[PDB]
Amino acid sequence: SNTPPVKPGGLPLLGHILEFGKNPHAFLMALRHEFGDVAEFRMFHQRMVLLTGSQASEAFYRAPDEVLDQGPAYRIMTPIFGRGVVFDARIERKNQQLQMLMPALRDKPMRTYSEIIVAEVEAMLRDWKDAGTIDLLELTKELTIYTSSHCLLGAEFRHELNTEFAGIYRDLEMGIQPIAYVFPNLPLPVFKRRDQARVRLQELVTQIMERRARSSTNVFQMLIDASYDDGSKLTPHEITGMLIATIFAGHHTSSGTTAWVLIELLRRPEYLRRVRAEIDALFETHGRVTFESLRQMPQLENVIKEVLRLHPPLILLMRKVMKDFEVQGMRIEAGKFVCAAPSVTHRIPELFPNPELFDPDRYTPERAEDKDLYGWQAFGGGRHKCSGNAFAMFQIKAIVCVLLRNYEFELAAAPESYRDDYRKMVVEPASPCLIRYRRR
């Protein structure tokens, strides 16, 4: 039929990758502005169709796995995750493993997660000096990696094996290099150290499984106790892969959004006063942080929601088109890729009036702009929506509570200097991001 519009200029081998790399958010904004809800560009030799707006986002998220494949986008992560683990397995096994992941990340385990998250933040606060200058993102990355490793992997990783796991994690993360998009299977020393790190982490998982069989609430144990539709149990390879995938999934996303919550609150003393009022009221009615965060935090909840609207950490959601797909009268042929851009759809004026303004009261029950499910798309949507939704929200909300209760903060640079680095694989606050603290 009528194919989607194609961005007119490009390089032969690279397509639009240079313009994309300069500012990805700007590139996607510009494609929408010039071509519309369904617009095609090229990265290297591959053709991507950006789907923006509620309609096209519904098309994207609502499409079945037999139509839109999640596999190829994760090809770089396969040496870390493992051969037959999530996204490199066939659709059935992939989805069964992901469903195994789902329960451990919501509902009942959250209350046990809460105590340790609060305890970790308190512990870090105790050994700081009374006042100083820190990097906010550095702090949030350390806090979120510690708390999520403890909650999801187990106490063994935060305590006895902490040093070796820190090493293995930095080696694995250093193994996630973009060059692999261009030249896959290129031999690199960082890749050698990544592979060795994965071997060692699988050894550690095997050991801990054996010891736990001799003798806790965590994703590690939920995967030990989980089974397929067949009575077959998960191998140590599969368990180590799925665990490291969850750890990687939540680290930079949650850290960046916590950082942005703090930055925006310090930028806007109105909302900082509202949120601190909520914190001080909850600390009186419900002594201590506790699970009081989970529930009666509406103001901080909406602050986090608007933070995710204006700074969504995942800016491009890519899937290959397996069967001819049609959006808005336009045919997307198999072999093309489709993409969802939360940063672009969140800034559509029809969906969000005055899009560049930061007002968390967009999400009040009276206005309900997060109602579409295919407009506000920070956690994705559909079958493959975020399974770490509640855990991430709670981690952010709890970390902000303990920090804001125990310390008072001042922005160490210009309020307008704090910006997004869209050139990062998971978008985070900009490199300097410095703050000052003094204890209350």
Ligand X SMILES: CCCCCCCCCCCCCCCC[N+](C)(C)C
Candidate list 28, 31, 50, 77; residue touching ligand X; CB under 6 A: 77
Q: Which of 241, 375 has the CB closer to ligand X?
A: 241
The contact mask relative to ligand X for 207-246 (x = CB under 6 A, - = no) is --------------------------------------xx
Strands 434-439 and 131-135: antiparallel
When asked if residue 252 is in the footprint of ligand X (CB under 6 A), the reply is yes
Partner from ligand X, ligand HEM, none binding residue 176, C-beta < 5-8 Å depending on class = ligand X
Q: Does 393 bind ligand X (CB under 6 A)?
A: no
Question: Helix, strand, coil shares of the chain as percentages rounded to 5?
Answer: 55, 15, 35
Closest CA to 289 of 372, 394, 179: 394
| Contact of residue 105 among ligand HEM, ligand X, none (CB under 5-8 Å per partner type) | ligand HEM
User: Which residue type does 352 have?
Assistant: F
For ligand X, which residue of 55, 96, 162, 177 counts as binding (CB under 6 A)? 177
Span of 163-171, 228-236, 387-395, 415-423 interacting with ligand HEM by CB under 6 A: 387-395
Is 76 an interacting residue with respect to ligand HEM (CB under 6 A)? no
Instruction: Tokens for 224, please give them.
Output: 């030990």
Nearest to 343 by CA among 355, 334, 333, 354: 355
Applying CB under 6 A, which part among 31-39, 170-178, 192-200, 381-389 lies near ligand HEM? 381-389
Return d(Cα 204, Cα 71) in angstroms, integer.
27
Task: Kindly compute the dihedral angle of the four CA atoms of residues 202, 396, 282, 301, in this order, to the nearest 10 degrees.
Answer: -130
Name which of 201 and 249 has its Cβ closer to ligand X: 249
Residues in contact with 149: Cβ distance below 8 Å, sequence separation at least 6, in sequence order: 157, 158, 165, 247
Exactly one of 391, 409, 418, 422 binds ligand HEM (CB under 6 A); that residue is 391
351 near ligand X (CB under 6 A): no
Assess 433 for contact with ligand X (CB under 6 A).
Answer: no
173: contact with ligand X by CB under 6 A: yes
CB of 239 to ligand HEM, least distance (A): 14
Q: Which two tokens stand for residue 145?
A: 């990696």
Q: Which of 20, 60, 248, 376 binds ligand X (CB under 6 A)?
A: 248
Burial class (CB in 10 A: 0-12, 13-18, 19+), 263: buried
Q: Is the distance from CB of 52 to CB of 341 less than 8 angstroms? A: yes
Among 50, 80, 105, 332, binds ligand HEM (CB under 6 A): 105
Reduced to 3 states (helix: H, G, I; strand: E, B; else coil), residue 223 is helix
| Alpha-carbon gap, residue 91 to 430, rounded angstroms | 37
Count Cβ atoms below 10 Å from residue 227 Cβ, excluding itself: 11
Tell me how far apart the alpha carbons of residues 99 and 383 are, in angstroms, rounded to a whole number: 10
Contacts 24+ apart (CB under 8 A), 129-132: 130/438, 130/439, 131/436, 131/437, 131/438, 131/439, 132/436, 132/437
The verdict on whether residue 319 carries a ligand-binding annotation is yes
Among 172, 392, 433, 435, binds ligand HEM (CB under 6 A): 392
Q: Is 74 annotated as a binding residue?
A: yes
Enumerate the known binding-site residues for heme.
Answer: 386
Output the known binding site for heme b.
70, 74, 319, 384, 386
Point out the annotated binding site: 70, 74, 319, 384, 386
Would you tell me which residues interact with ligand X (CB under 6 A)?
77, 86, 173-174, 176-177, 245-246, 248-249, 252, 425-426
Chain contacts with ligand HEM (rule: CB under 6 A): 70, 98, 101, 105, 246, 249-250, 253-254, 257, 313-314, 317, 378-380, 384, 386-388, 391-392
